[PDB]
Ligand binder design. Structure first.
Ligand SMILES: Nc1ncnc2c1ncn2[C@@H]1O[C@H](COP(=O)(O)OP(=O)(O)OP(O)(O)=S)[C@@H](O)[C@H]1O
Ligand SMILES: Nc1ncnc2c1ncn2[C@@H]1O[C@H](COP(=O)(O)OP(=O)(O)OP(O)(O)=S)[C@@H](O)[C@H]1O
Ligand SMILES: Nc1ncnc2c1ncn2[C@@H]1O[C@H](COP(=O)(O)OP(=O)(O)OP(O)(O)=S)[C@@H](O)[C@H]1O
Ligand SMILES: N[C@@H](CCC(=O)O)C(=O)O
Ligand SMILES: C[C@@H](O)[C@H](N)C(=O)O
Ligand SMILES: [Mg+2]
Ligand SMILES: [Mg+2]
Ligand SMILES: [Mg+2]
Lengths: 335, 315, 325, 293
């Protein structure tokens, strides 16, 4: 029992077969029917973090080949590996040119064993443009015995020729509408007792990332188990664990911005940043508050939307949170 | 098989070379005199530099061309060891030539020579200038180190005019018995942009394609130079006109965004009409768009935004 | 063996008659080989227009079925430094034909990936051995090619595939397979192709996979949108109408609902709305300037990730502010 | 054995000799292996301009089994560097190795090399790769249009090749001429840093067994005509290792500019086919004529 309970829930509940993948049916159906058609094309999976791309490719390979044959039919490379132009021109090319290994009788009787290998390039968006160009004719020339699978979060980082060569699969964001069943199943398997709506709140907070939601659920379960009171988990505890600013603090910030005094805003922000709140979460909450508020006019909403977009882009660039937050609050106050 | 017209009709003599009339006349004077000094020939591609140097060497050395000329280009080994051994031995060779004649070392595409080899050539030129002379051919004269330039007479070739291109095209047509029209020759000259190699290639392609060289027949295969299209796009007084040009004439024809932005920068560098402040602002906007394209966002929307920003700069 | 191949490779043209959408270039090259006067060639064009297919078909026509013996093909997957040019290419170009089969052919696919030094070394190799050898260069980006190399080559532009050629190729694929395509589905496929045949073939293969019973089921536009996960035209029209007519709350709700209905991506909606607005008749020109600048900024920000809701609100606000002028 | 092909021998000189002969064609590239009832052949090609084929016959192996039925021959491709390294480490104790066996079990299986000692056996499996579209049979001698043929002793040819290599020869010219009174002239003319040099084989039946010029049809012998073949030394010198062990060498040049060298060392037989350069410069032709006259 201890051996099974020695893994984080994200890795513990990683899908084993393509049936366990959720909310990505538009591509899973094609991949599944490929097991019978044996007509797998070159694939380009792209999508936001934690949507099931790596899990999907691993499950597909396992279903196609099996525990034994996979070791000779799969070549996986990711960002942790060296992937320079020389690597692409020598190692990837050599593997793509390798003859298809002979399946055993057990493999043939138990698995389809298609007559080609698979090269997986995870985090392909980290590869240089020249290295990507080095793959163009390797993919076409040896398509009879090799199929390529590129995976990325930013599709624009893939050069246009490679995107053209690969059939594209977009993995959708996992939210409270399409990923609730999997999270509920995971909670039931672990006997996590939670109040109604807690799972939906977790999914809403995760914002399209099921891995984050599973980690949050595991943290809440650990806290509840340590407390050992037998009470159900609450949305307030989930928000606190997720780093969501309490509503009262956001209201105080809003009133300070409405006051319009630069010095008071500066002092309040200086005190607020001591708590360590992430600026991204505060900006997201402010956007949700202001954009959905019915007490403001169209011009104010347009200006604040542009201001929030600029601040979010600057933060994504990796800037000082205090400066950006103070600038945004001052700008909103001058509106 | 039949050679392509570019190589089939390469001139054998200096008299058949058109353009840069003063330069070709000076070369003919040198050829008929003999006292050839170290020389550098610079200019844009396809204007006769290689042809001029080879014809001059042939006429100077007569029957002794085989044993009196050493030719090296970027496709051969030209490192420091080559200078140390092959060029040195050639320059040391004692060859009996007619009075006023010297051995010629032709270094085509000399700009690509390594720094060490160029430095080594200094002593060779200093020691063996009595019996050997060097003819460098390049596109950028400044890419030859100054110590070597100091010993050589500079000769810069200008872009060929429409008149000389038309004259030699008419000669080629007479030789080939090609049916044509005036508008077709004008279109060929316009598309050549002063490069005669391209002019002959396009003439051969048109003659093959349809037999009759018409403007419509010429434009079926050959396209108008895209730098002029980019200039027209940039100089448009209305944003709608610029967008329409970008769409119809560039994007729908398959021109890549990176090529479009690079050409835009090159064209803006030479916009005489515009003011300096406007020009530098346009350069800044083009550079920002180029940076965005290099990151992977090579979309038509980015080019449209660049055009909009340029139009704002104009206003 | 061809059955197991992906459709992009399974339907690669084998003869010049199978290359569509490049009538002028194809006719010129066919007649050149007929007269045996092939010059040095450059094929410039965007991805998936038939450059590699055309050159391979021309080699097959010239040398029949033994072209592999007298054709030297090099691409970006191979090293093509100055040493390679000096030794391998030079030796191949300076040697006689296998059986005196006219001239030899050297194909430099994706030559825009070659270094400046190698390209410079190639000039005199091309010029000196023109009698025995002819060079073919293929490129998507001309700015990477040196002026001398461009001057030495006869240029041919592969345009984006016209609609009619795509329709003919799709009909050929449909007769080959046991597949049925609806006129609206074909229209959507052509619209999303952007003149690239690879995209058409890949999307058609995915659509066939999506069909439960391909022997009798017909592909509709809905199947194409599901396979590509792209927005429908109606969704784009509704979103634009809500943005341009309704209030901020209504527009936000409409965008959220349209996106959540099918898990659409914001970048696809932005591209569709930009295409729609490109045909709008604007009486104020500053509106176009603001639209283009702000939407390009939003696209660039999206390309690096960020917050999705903030970006959608930014799109709404940018459109509203631009049209308020 | 249960393998489709299995050949075992007790002489380790054949394998190392073949690998050494194949080495000059590149230490890091591909080698094609042909397997048939007649024997096992190693094939290499360089730059589509030169080809080498070394044949190990059935007699060379103490045991040879080829049980394949569907196909009369088997084709595979291996990396020469892998075999070179594996044999170099495994052959360090060359005195103790007693048996060497090759095995193969059709497409999709590795090429198995086993060195069997008195009490220790080392087994190595080489992965196979797809064979390039280029056909090695394309570069072949047209047996109906032989321009000339000649038979030479191995030692003299090896000495000539060494002399050419040591002077840094850059261009080679094979000159073959025949006259009356059994007068033969076979020579190699080298263009190098030294200029133009000549190596002439004697007209005796101990270094030049026979020489014939057939006017490009293999039938009509013509006297007074000289056949000149222009080659780049980078490819001509690739036969030096093969000639080192050669006992007799047969040169055969056709009208299509193809030169074939047959090297005979029960034995190891090597075929090297090379292409001639496009043309000869006027200066080179004049120098060659002056040298030969
Ligand atoms: N569609 C899904 N179905 C089921 N579990 C999922 C799904 N997506 C993510 N998960 C869970 O999240 C974990 C991570 O999934 P991944 O497939 O690695 O996500 P991802 O798309 O690869 O994220 P990136 O792009 O590497 S940041 C899995 O082990 C699952 O526990
Ligand atoms: N002035 C000219 N008169 C006649 N033909 C010309 C002239 N310039 C170029 N050509 C033609 O173009 C061919 C190439 O000329 P070259 O002199 O080799 O070009 P180039 O000036 O050397 O350009 P680069 O520097 O080598 S790229 C010649 O063989 C002619 O057919
Ligand atoms: N003109 C065409 N006619 C028919 N099919 C085409 C055509 N162009 C492309 N295709 C299809 O698309 C595939 C790829 O064509 P290619 O010629 O390799 O693309 P490309 O023009 O070389 O683009 P790049 O430069 O390599 S990204 C072919 O195998 C065909 O299935
Ligand atoms: N903002 C513009 C309206 C633009 C339009 O409706 O096209 C006024 O006038
Ligand atoms: C609506 C109003 O601003 C108009 N676009 C002008 O005037
Ligand atoms: Mg992943
Ligand atoms: Mg030149
Ligand atoms: Mg291509």
């Amino acid at each position: 029992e201890q051996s099974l309970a020695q893994q984080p829930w994200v890795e513990k509940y990683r899908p084993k077969n393509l049936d366990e993948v959720t909310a990505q049916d538009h591509a899973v159906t094609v991949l599944k029917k490929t097991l019978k058609s044996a007509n797998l094309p070159h694939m380009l999976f792209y999508g936001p973090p934690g949507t099931g791309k790596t899990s999907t490719i691993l499950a597909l390979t396992k279903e196609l080949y099996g525990p034994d044959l996979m070791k000779s039919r799969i070549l996986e490379l990711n960002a942790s590996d060296e992937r320079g132009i020389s690597i692409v021109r020598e190692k990837v090319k050599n593997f793509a040119r390798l003859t298809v290994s002979k399946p055993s009788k057990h493999d043939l009787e138990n698995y389809p064993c298609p007559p080609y290998k698979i090269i997986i390039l995870d985090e392909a968006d980290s590869m240089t443009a020249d290295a990507q160009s080095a793959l163009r004719r390797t993919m076409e020339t040896y398509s009879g015995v090799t199929r390529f699978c590129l995976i990325c979060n930013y599709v624009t980082r893939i050069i246009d020729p490679l995107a053209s060569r690969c059939s594209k699969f977009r993995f959708k964001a996992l939210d409270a509408s399409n990923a609730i069943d999997r999270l509920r199943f995971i909670s039931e398997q672990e006997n996590v007792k939670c109040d109604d709506g807690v799972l939906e709140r977790i999914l809403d907070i995760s914002a399209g990332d099921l891995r984050r939601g599973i980690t949050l659920l595991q943290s809440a379960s650990k806290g509840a188990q340590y407390l050992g009171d037998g009470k159900n988990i609450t949305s307030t505890q989930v928000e606190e664990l997720a780093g969501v600013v309490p509503h009262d603090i956001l209201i105080e910030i809003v009133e300070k911005v409405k006051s319009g005094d630069f010095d008071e805003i500066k002092k309040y922000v200086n005190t607020f940043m001591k708590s360590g709140w992430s600026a991204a979460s505060v900006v997201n909450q402010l956007h949700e508050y202001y954009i959905t508020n019915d007490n403001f006019d169209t011009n104010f909403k347009n200006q604040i939307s542009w201001l929030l977009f600029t601040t979010d882009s600057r933060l994504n660039n990796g800037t000082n949170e205090h400066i950006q937050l103070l600038n945004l609050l001052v700008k909103i106050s001058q509106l | 098989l039949q050679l392509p017209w570019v190589e089939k009709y390469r001139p054998q003599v200096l008299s058949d070379i058109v353009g840069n009339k003063e330069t070709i006349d000076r070369l003919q004077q040198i050829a008929k005199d003999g006292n050839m000094p170290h020389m550098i020939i610079s200019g844009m591609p396809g204007i006769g530099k290689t042809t001029s140097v080879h014809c001059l060497a042939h006429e100077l050395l007569g029957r002794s061309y085989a044993d009196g000329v050493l030719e090296l280009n970027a496709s051969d080994d030209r490192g420091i060891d080559v200078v140390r051994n092959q060029i040195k031995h050639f320059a040391q060779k004692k060859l009996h030539l007619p009075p006023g004649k010297h051995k010629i070392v032709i270094l085509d595409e000399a700009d690509s020579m390594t720094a060490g080899a160029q430095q080594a050539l200094r002593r060779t030129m200093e020691l063996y200038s009595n019996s050997t002379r060097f003819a460098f051919a390049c596109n950028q004269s400044n890419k030859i180190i100054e110590p070597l330039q100091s010993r050589c007479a500079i000769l810069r070739y200008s872009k060929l005019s429409d008149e000389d291109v038309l004259k030699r095209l008419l000669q080629i047509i007479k030789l080939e018995d090609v049916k044509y029209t005036n508008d077709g020759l004008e279109a060929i000259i316009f598309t050549a942009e002063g490069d005669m190699r391209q002019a002959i290639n396009n003439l051969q392609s048109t003659v093959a394609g349809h037999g009759l060289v018409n403007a419509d027949n010429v434009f079926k295969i050959v396209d108008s130079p895209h730098p002029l299209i980019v200039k027209k796009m940039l100089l448009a007084s209305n944003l709608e006109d610029s967008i329409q040009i970008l769409r119809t004439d560039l994007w729908k024809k398959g021109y890549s965004s990176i090529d479009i932005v690079t050409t835009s920068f090159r064209v803006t560098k030479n916009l005489a009409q515009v003011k300096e402040s406007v020009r530098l602002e346009m350069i800044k906007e083009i550079g920002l768009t180029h940076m965005r394209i290099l990151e992977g966002v090579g979309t038509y929307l980015q080019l449209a935004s660049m055009l909009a920003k340029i139009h704002k700069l104009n206003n | 063996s061809k059955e197991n191949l992906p459709w992009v490779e399974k339907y690669r043209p084998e003869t010049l008659d199978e290359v569509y959408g490049q009538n002028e270039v194809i006719t010129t090259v066919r007649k050149f080989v007929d007269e045996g006067k092939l010059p040095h060639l450059l094929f410039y064009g965007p991805p998936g227009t038939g450059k590699t297919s055309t050159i391979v078909a021309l080699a097959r026509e010239i040398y029949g079925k033994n072209y592999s013996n007298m054709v030297l093909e090099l691409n970006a997957s191979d090293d093509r430094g100055i040493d390679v040019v000096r030794n391998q290419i030079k030796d191949f170009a300076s040697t006689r034909q296998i059986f005196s089969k006219g001239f030899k052919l050297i194909i430099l696919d994706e030559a825009d990936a070659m270094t400046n030094a190698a390209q410079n070394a190639l000039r005199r190799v091309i010029e000196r051995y023109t009698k025995n050898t002819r060079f073919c260069v293929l490129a998507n980006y001309a700015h990477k090619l040196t002026p001398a190399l461009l001057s030495r080559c006869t240029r041919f532009r592969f345009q984006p595939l016209p609609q009619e050629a795509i329709e003919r190729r799709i009909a050929n694929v449909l007769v080959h397979e046991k597949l049925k395509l609806s006129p609206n589905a074909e229209k959507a496929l052509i619209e999303l192709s952007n003149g690239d045949m690879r995209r058409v073939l890949n999307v058609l293969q995915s659509c066939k996979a999506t069909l439960d019973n391909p022997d009798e089921d017909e592909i509709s536009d809905d199947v194409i949108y599901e396979c590509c996960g792209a927005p429908r035209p109606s969704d784009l029209k509704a979103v634009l109408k809500s943005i341009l007519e309704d209030d901020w709350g209504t527009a936000h709700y409409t965008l959220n609902k349209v996106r959540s209905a099918k898990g659409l991506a914001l970048i696809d909606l932005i591209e569709g709305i930009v295409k729609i607005l490109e045909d709008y008749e604007l009486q104020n020109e500053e509106t176009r300037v603001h639209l283009l600048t702000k939407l390009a900024d939003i696209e660039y920000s999206i390309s690096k990730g960020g917050n999705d809701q903030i970006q959608g609100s930014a799109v709404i606000g940018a459109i509203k502010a631009s049209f308020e002028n | 054995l249960a393998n489709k092909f299995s050949a075992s021998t007790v002489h380790l000189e054949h394998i190392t000799t073949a690998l050494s002969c194949l080495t000059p064609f590149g230490s890091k590239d591909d080698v094609l292996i042909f397997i048939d009832a007649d024997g096992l052949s190693f094939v290499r090609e360089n730059n589509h301009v030169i080809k080498i084929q070394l044949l190990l016959s059935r007699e060379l192996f103490m045991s040879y089994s080829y049980r394949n039925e569907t196909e009369d021959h088997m084709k595979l491709c291996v990396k020469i560097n892998h075999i070179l390294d594996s044999v170099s480490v495994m052959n360090r104790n060359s005195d103790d190795i007693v048996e060497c066996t090759l095995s193969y079990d059709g497409h999709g299986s590795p090429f198995v090399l086993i060195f069997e000692d008195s009490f220790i056996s080392e087994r190595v499996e080489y992965s196979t790769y797809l064979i390039k579209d280029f056909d090695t049979n394309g570069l072949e001698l047209d047996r109906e249009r032989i321009s000339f043929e000649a038979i030479i002793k191995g030692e003299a040819l090896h000495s000539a090749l060494k002399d050419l290599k040591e002077i840094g020869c850059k261009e080679c010219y094979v000159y073959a001429k025949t006259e009356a009174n059994d007068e033969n002239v076979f020579a190699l003319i080298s263009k190098s840093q030294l200029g133009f040099s000549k190596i002439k084989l004697p007209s005796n039946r101990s270094i030049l067994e026979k020489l014939q010029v057939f006017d490009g049809d293999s039938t009509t012998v013509i006297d007074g005509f000289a056949v000149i073949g222009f080659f780049d030394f980078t490819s001509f010198d690739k036969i030096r290792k093969s000639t080192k062990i050669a006992s007799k060498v047969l040169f055969r040049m056709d009208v299509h500019g193809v030169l074939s060298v047959n090297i005979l060392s029960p034995g190891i037989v090597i075929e090297v086919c090379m292409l001639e350069k496009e043309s000869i410069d006027e200066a080179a032709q004049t120098e060659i004529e002056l040298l030969m006259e």
